[PDB]
Amino acid sequence: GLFGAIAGFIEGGWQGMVDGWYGYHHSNEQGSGYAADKESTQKAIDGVTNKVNSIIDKMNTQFEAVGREFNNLERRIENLNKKMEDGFLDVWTYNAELLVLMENERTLDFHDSNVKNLYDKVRLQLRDNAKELGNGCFEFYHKCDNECMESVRNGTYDYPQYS
Amino acid sequence: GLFGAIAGFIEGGWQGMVDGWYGYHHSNEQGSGYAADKESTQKAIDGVTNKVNSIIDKMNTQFEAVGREFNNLERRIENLNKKMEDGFLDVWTYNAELLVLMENERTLDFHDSNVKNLYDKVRLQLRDNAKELGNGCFEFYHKCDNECMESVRNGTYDYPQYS
Amino acid sequence: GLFGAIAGFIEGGWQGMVDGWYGYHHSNEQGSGYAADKESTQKAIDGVTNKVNSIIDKMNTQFEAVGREFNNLERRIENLNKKMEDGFLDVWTYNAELLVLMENERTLDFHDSNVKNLYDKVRLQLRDNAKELGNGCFEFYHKCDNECMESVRNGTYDYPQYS
Amino acid sequence: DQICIGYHANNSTEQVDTIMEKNVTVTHAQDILEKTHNGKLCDLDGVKPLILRDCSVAGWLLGNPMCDEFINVPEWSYIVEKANPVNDLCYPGDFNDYEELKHLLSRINHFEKIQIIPKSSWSSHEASLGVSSACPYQGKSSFFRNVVWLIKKNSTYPTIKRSYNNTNQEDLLVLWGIHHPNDAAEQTKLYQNPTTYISVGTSTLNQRLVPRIATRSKVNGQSGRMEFFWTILKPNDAINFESNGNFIAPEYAYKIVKKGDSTIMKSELEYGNCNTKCQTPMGAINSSMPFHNIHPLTIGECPKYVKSNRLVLATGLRNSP
Amino acid sequence: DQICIGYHANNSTEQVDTIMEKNVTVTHAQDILEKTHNGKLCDLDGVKPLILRDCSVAGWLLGNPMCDEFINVPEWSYIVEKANPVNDLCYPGDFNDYEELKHLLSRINHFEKIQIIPKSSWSSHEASLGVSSACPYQGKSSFFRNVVWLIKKNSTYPTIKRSYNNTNQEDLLVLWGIHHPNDAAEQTKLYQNPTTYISVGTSTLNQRLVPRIATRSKVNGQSGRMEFFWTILKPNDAINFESNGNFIAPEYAYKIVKKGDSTIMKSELEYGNCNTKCQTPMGAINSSMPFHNIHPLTIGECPKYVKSNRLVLATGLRNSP
Amino acid sequence: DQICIGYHANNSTEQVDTIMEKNVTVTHAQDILEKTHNGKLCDLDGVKPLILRDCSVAGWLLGNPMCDEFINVPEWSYIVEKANPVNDLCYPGDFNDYEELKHLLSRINHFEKIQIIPKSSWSSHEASLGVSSACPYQGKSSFFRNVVWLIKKNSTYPTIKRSYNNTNQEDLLVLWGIHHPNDAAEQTKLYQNPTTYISVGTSTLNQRLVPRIATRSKVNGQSGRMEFFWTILKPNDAINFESNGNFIAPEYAYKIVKKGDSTIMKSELEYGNCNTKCQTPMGAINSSMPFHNIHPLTIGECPKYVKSNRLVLATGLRNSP
Ligand SMILES: CC(=O)N[C@@H]1[C@@H](O)[C@H](O[C@H]2O[C@H](CO)[C@H](O)[C@H](O[C@]3(C(=O)O)C[C@H](O)[C@@H](NC(C)=O)[C@H]([C@H](O)[C@H](O)CO)O3)[C@H]2O)[C@@H](COS(=O)(=O)O)O[C@H]1O
Ligand SMILES: CC(=O)N[C@@H]1[C@@H](O)[C@H](O[C@H]2O[C@H](CO)[C@H](O)[C@H](O[C@]3(C(=O)O)C[C@H](O)[C@@H](NC(C)=O)[C@H]([C@H](O)[C@H](O)CO)O3)[C@H]2O)[C@@H](COS(=O)(=O)O)O[C@H]1O
Ligand SMILES: CC(=O)N[C@@H]1[C@@H](O)[C@H](O[C@H]2O[C@H](CO)[C@H](O)[C@H](O[C@]3(C(=O)O)C[C@H](O)[C@@H](NC(C)=O)[C@H]([C@H](O)[C@H](O)CO)O3)[C@H]2O)[C@@H](COS(=O)(=O)O)O[C@H]1O
Ligand SMILES: *[C@@H]1O[C@H](CO)[C@@H](O)[C@H](O)[C@H]1NC(C)=O
Ligand SMILES: *[C@@H]1O[C@H](CO)[C@@H](O)[C@H](O)[C@H]1NC(C)=O
Ligand SMILES: *[C@@H]1O[C@H](CO)[C@@H](O)[C@H](O)[C@H]1NC(C)=O
């Protein structure tokens, strides 16, 4: 992906995280576990919903064929009429297929972007209080209990306390 | 945004910066103030101008309706003629509306990209000579006067001097 | 570019690297040299190939003009027929020209993305064992021989050994 | 202790295409193309289609005796005509501006038939031996039920002069015709008068038909021809006939009570006794998809037709192996 | 001490839409859709439109006496005709290939009228009592000014044989017609000869018209009909008439001096005495926008028509709250 | 010691455009637009075009004596007709439904000509003095080779009654015509009978032509006119003629042996004796490009036409200075 996170420096997804698209997985003395990041997830859900509705509505008004009849000595205008109806179907078929193609690619990179921004968000909080392992993980210098972990997901990681 | 800077780790814009789109705000003993980054700003101005002209010119040649008259026993070709004229308007209406939609999104992410690249440009100069606060700001270890600040905007930040 | 690498913090390309699109250049006691990164390069080659074929195939079915003849008192339907044939050419001309325009921009940013992701990949391995110079280069604290260099290109840079 | 950032994966196999990569497996997707139909011709919004079966529009409208089912038809949602219906014009001929009339039927939901010229009323001429073996009904030689093939009485065809005033507050589809005999001998045999004509006039119409004689190939056992004409007679306007031979008079004229969205669908298919809100020639559609790929000509509240086999949107993200 | 990186915000409320998000407030935007017009019909590049007001193209061209304003018209930029102009064909009838002629007018900016058959010149026939009450002028019964309704003189309609050679180095629009009487009694009353014809020939044209008689509804107080025909007579070519009755002769024929971009705009609107460089049926346009949404049929240097209500491009960036 | 990350540059000058920036130099690009042609008209897939040179489709099909080359033509890939071929209708006239026939030729690859009415067989009438100076061959006055201009023998034109049964298992293009004389004196001079007709009938066709007389401008030295009609005679169906004057009989009728993709290309160009698989009016195309910009009307396996001057795709990356 463009943003290098999904199938990138984060090599794979988590079957174990079912309550969201992006999130955290912690492991300390008291245990481990997955927690979905609600904010980034809800933003992704809204962005894609709108995308789909935007796409539906833009295709909503499009060419509609009507049947017309022509006799044996009106072959030219029968043929004109066919090429006109066909011509518009190709155009509207191309539009739909291309839009899907282009926006699918944008949708996957959107997801890639969101993971990366969430990873950086965390990276910026921790600063030099943890080792950047290079696989999506940050290894703490201080022992980090479940409130310390929540502190990071909170957005409230108290840097001055652990430095 | 895709690049995580605008309304991201930089939570908001600056009403106080009027002479450009992207820039710096410093605060030291001698005072504070906004300085627009000309280079990144002029690049953004060119990119968008071209974008707008590119869009205008691509729509420049497009279907034009002409009036045609048909009598009471030419109803089929009257109807053919209507669907043909209407059919092209829907196509050219869809094109315009979609292009605007798609390129607007690209325009906003372009701006997001430019801020992020300017933030990284600065980040790369300072290196470990300042604290990365996580909000767009870098807090210096050494006292940084107005030449030291200009030094950063210059692109000329002398790292060996302050390390 | 969007991703800030090409013509960005990496100011220019390498005439000296002929065996790939992205790669590394090392310089130590034993010598210097260019080595193309195969994986990122082959991915770029596939992505662009598919892109080009995808574009060709989407334009494959498109309006085709046919000659039709009309006498002196069939001027209306002659004119209808002209505007119909012309109308579709403008549409299919706009489609082709726009697609090229839009996908060219995406192609250049794709390349920009790939360099950046390769630079970050390396950055993440080295961690604090080298100085991030800010120009695409990492200057090592330890002496780094040609196996040490290969170790970095390998993906196998042994951080615990050199820290 | 550590904390990681990551993303969802699952047991999904759904794939989508992009410009640069095809068959990309994702965690969530949304098909937007409707690919299926029930395979039947069906009532639209409750309202039944006029299925002509083996009769044509001409056969129905002229009242071909094989099209007995379609005397006094109820209102329809749309019409279904086969590609080459066998019961078209029993007596060989042409229908004048047939396609322009069929087009008018797309704007029409219901006809109500009414008599304007009583068959009895032809006291001066003979009306009951205007038949041919080309149009048989129950074994006996019959004719188009809505028009009268007038012939001479005791060897005299006096000039006909008939006028009908449309006092219904509706438009009225009037139908009539002319007979084109085989030779000058048959002309005199049927109508006596060697040179004949039919003059039809309205506020707009100013017509004068003459029979053209020619040697023609036997179609349906007859080398004679009938050429049928029509008009819409606006309310409060009168139509005037005058003829000295070869005239096919109107008995009945269809009255146009309802004008709405309709269409003449072409289909070999029959009737499923099913209901829908989107119909095609190949079947009916029941979906919320924004698109379908069944058949371009549809009627009713329909998704948009495209030629695609596949339209799937990624909603989720790249699913890991 | 610190240095920050940031971006512009301002007091702007302008919003734009994107695929994923709508009503996104931005610092700068650019409307590209022109939504307004002055509401008037106007001179195009200085050059005035031919506004027929209540006259039709036929009424003007045949010289209907109510269309006195439009005798010897100056050159026009475009033409304006109402939807259903009352002053069309005063005497009931049809205009043959009317739509094909109207189409020709889209290629025409100026006619210059000239006389080819002098009204006096009809010495053998009577030319001054060729009128009807259907076309009244100043109370008295009149007729189409550009054509002569010829009748018999002292109970004789001798064969007419007239030829006009086009020696102008221009194309020439010639107009003529035929009268279709009510009954055989009126045929003889007007022209005497029971069977009549009109033969018109050119290098291309080879025509022979005959009057068709029928009982017709009284339109504008008359059950008689006129059927008008036309041709373009190329320079150095002669047109030849021959008729023994029912002939409507050309007095004047329009000469085609200028051919340019024109159009027959349909509008109930009148004249604002305004100037423009882009005109529509609903009004005129003065903008630099690349688009508009007023009306599809325009004339002149115009922005492109779209059905959109809104087309706004983000130029600036997402504006903060 | 250090390691850097970087990207390729080279001596390329190829540029491409994007939305935001134009003339961007890149390391690699791919032109997808074919801009060139050989400038010649050429064999398509081996199969030669029917190049009529200065003859028209009518001239060829009626067998104009100047179109001697195109008697018994071999099968063609496509047809080439000039814009205004000089050798069209030598004797002034009209070709009825000419454009509808030309359209039929787009579905036709080969005609085989056959005789249905022997020229000798006209024993009751005179067939060998049916010529005019408008169609000269080798100095002498000649006529359309495929049709017989019949005239009276010893001052009598008896009624013609001829029937041809199509027993070939093919469709058959039949051609005939009528002569429109100058005056009543020439009518009697040629055919004697003052009032004449031609009745043509098939299973579908029911026609009766009458000669229209008019004074006409001399085109090609003649003020007389010929009006040519046609039909497709289906196999096992008979066509029946009957006429008492003014009849142009069929000698030969073209037989339709092969139906395939063809087209009537319009080009002033001649023949390069070259072979191709994609032809245009301006020349032939030999490329693997998905697009071209030569001319919209093509025939064969062709790239898609666009109006672009340039279509270049970036494959590589931004090339450094
Ligand atoms: C080989 C041969 O010579 N056979 C003779 C038959 O041709 C002939 O009758 C048949 O042909 C005549 C005219 O040529 C008729 O077409 C007739 O068919 C009918 C029909 O059913 O369509 C009979 C109808 O009663 C008649 N109806 C009216 C209202 O006139 C119509 C009508 O005349 C034509 O269709 C109008 O063009 O024709 C068909 O049976 C027979 C018997 O002759 S008879 O018809 O005079 O009785 O004799 C054969 O030798
Ligand atoms: C109830 C009744 O019987 N009323 C009689 C009237 O019908 C009749 O005059 C009226 O009818 C005649 C023919 O039926 C005419 O249409 C006539 O109108 C005019 C007209 O203005 O259009 C009179 C014109 O002078 C005449 N012009 C020419 C050049 O011929 C035309 C013309 O004949 C027709 O338009 C061609 O079809 O018709 C109308 O007034 C009156 C008087 O009869 S009279 O016309 O012979 O004087 O008598 C009533 O009792
Ligand atoms: C100035 C003057 O008076 N000239 C007289 C000529 O007009 C006349 O011959 C010419 O005119 C006649 C009729 O007006 C013919 O058009 C004739 O041309 C031909 C032709 O080649 O087309 C001669 C053919 O032999 C004839 N062919 C047949 C089968 O009829 C045709 C045909 O009649 C017309 O085309 C049908 O419309 O016409 C042309 O030479 C000459 C000689 O008179 S003659 O033709 O009767 O011999 O006399 C001049 O005084
Ligand atoms: C993608 O998969 C489809 C069906 O699963 C198959 O027909 C097609 O060949 C595949 N295409 C590619 C490029 O792998
Ligand atoms: C019949 O039609 C005439 C016109 O032909 C009209 O004036 C009249 O009002 C109608 N009805 C009656 C009952 O007269
Ligand atoms: C966006 O704004 C328009 C105009 O102010 C308003 O009518 C509409 O309801 C809004 N739509 C959404 C999705 O917010």
Ligand SMILES: *[C@@H]1O[C@H](CO)[C@@H](O)[C@H](O)[C@H]1NC(C)=O
């Ligand atoms: C008149 O037209 C004829 C043809 O009808 C042409 O040959 C001639 O040159 C024209 N002018 C004169 C003055 O004869």
Ligand SMILES: *[C@@H]1O[C@H](CO)[C@@H](O)[C@H](O)[C@H]1NC(C)=O
């Ligand atoms: C780009 O280059 C083309 C071809 O060399 C030249 O004609 C054109 O003026 C240039 N346009 C711009 C905007 O640089």
Ligand SMILES: *[C@@H]1O[C@H](CO)[C@@H](O)[C@H](O)[C@H]1NC(C)=O
């Ligand atoms: C000739 O045509 C007739 C119909 O007109 C057909 O029935 C017959 O089979 C054909 N051939 C022969 C040899 O009679």
Ligand SMILES: *[C@H]1O[C@H](CO)[C@@H](O)[C@H](O)[C@H]1NC(C)=O
């Ligand atoms: C988040 O969690 C910590 C405990 O782990 C709590 O003390 C703090 O107040 C919380 N803050 C927010 C914003 O939820």
Ligand SMILES: *[C@H]1O[C@H](CO)[C@@H](O)[C@H](O)[C@H]1NC(C)=O
């Ligand atoms: C930038 O500013 C510094 C001091 O602030 C000055 O000494 C230096 O010359 C400047 N360099 C450039 C490239 O402007």
Ligand SMILES: *[C@H]1O[C@H](CO)[C@@H](O)[C@H](O)[C@H]1NC(C)=O
């Ligand atoms: C890469 O290179 C090192 C020496 O530089 C070698 O020892 C090692 O086996 C290699 N590893 C891989 C994964 O190729």
